[PDB]
Amino acid sequence: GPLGSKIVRIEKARDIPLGATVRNEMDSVIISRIVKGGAAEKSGLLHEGDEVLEINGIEIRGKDVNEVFDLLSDMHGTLTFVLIPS
Amino acid sequence: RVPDLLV
């Protein structure tokens, strides 16, 4: 995919985080840690250093991490991530 | 300094 990206799907429950922290690096959103015991880890599809380009068609690149927190806090169901691997 | 938010 664009910029050498990849598509991964992960299920999210209402009001339960996936288990991944994010930080801004320049204009990008980067996965800084995979929380042990969370859905993100068990999925084995999200990894530290991954850049998040899109989630459910929403462009994540260019967003402050606080806006990304807001978006995911109320998302649920099948989440479609567009990622650039580390 | 860089903020790390949990999602």
Author numbering:
A (entry chain A): 250 to 335
B (entry chain C): 205 to 211
Q: What do the study authors state?
A:
PALS1 PDZ:SARS-CoV-1_E and PALS1 PDZ:SARS-CoV-2_E superimposed with one another yielded an overall root‐mean‐square deviation (RMSD) of 0.72 Å. Key hydrogen bond and ionic interactions between the PALS1 PDZ:SARS-CoV-2_E are identical with SARS-CoV-1_E. Major differences are found among the hydrophobic contacts, with the rotamer of SARS-CoV-1_E Leu73 differing from SARS-CoV-2_E Leu74. A comparison of our structures with apo-PALS1 PDZ reveals that similarly, both SARS-CoV-1_E and SARS-CoV-2_E binding to PALS1 PDZ trigger rotation of PALS1 Phe318 out of the ligand-binding groove to allow binding of SARS-CoV-1/2_E PBM. Our ITC measurements revealed that whilst PALS1 PDZ did not bind to MERS-CoV_E, it bound to SARS-CoV-1_E with an affinity of 29.6 μM, and SARS-CoV-2_E with an affinity of 22.8 μM. However, despite the sequence differences between SARS-CoV-1_E and SARS-CoV-2_E PBM in positions −5 and −6, affinities for PALS1 PDZ are comparable, indicating that positions 0, −1, −2 and −3 are required for CoV_E PBM interaction with PALS1 PDZ and define binding, whereas positions −4, −5, −6 and −8 do not play a major role.
PALS1 regulates cell polarity through binding to the PDZ-binding domain (PBM) of CRB3 with loss of PALS1 leading to disruption of cell polarity including loss of integrity of tight and adherens junctions. Importantly, the SARS-CoV-1 E protein’s PDZ-binding motif13 sequence allows interaction with the host cell polarity signalling protein PALS1 (Protein associated with Lin7/MPP5) thus interfering with epithelial function and integrity, a property of the SARS-CoV-1 E protein which is thought to be important for its virulence. Examination of both the PALS1 PDZ:SARS-CoV-1_E and PALS1 PDZ:SARS-CoV-2_E complexes showed that the E protein PBM peptides are bound in the canonical ligand-binding groove formed by the β2 strand and helix α2.
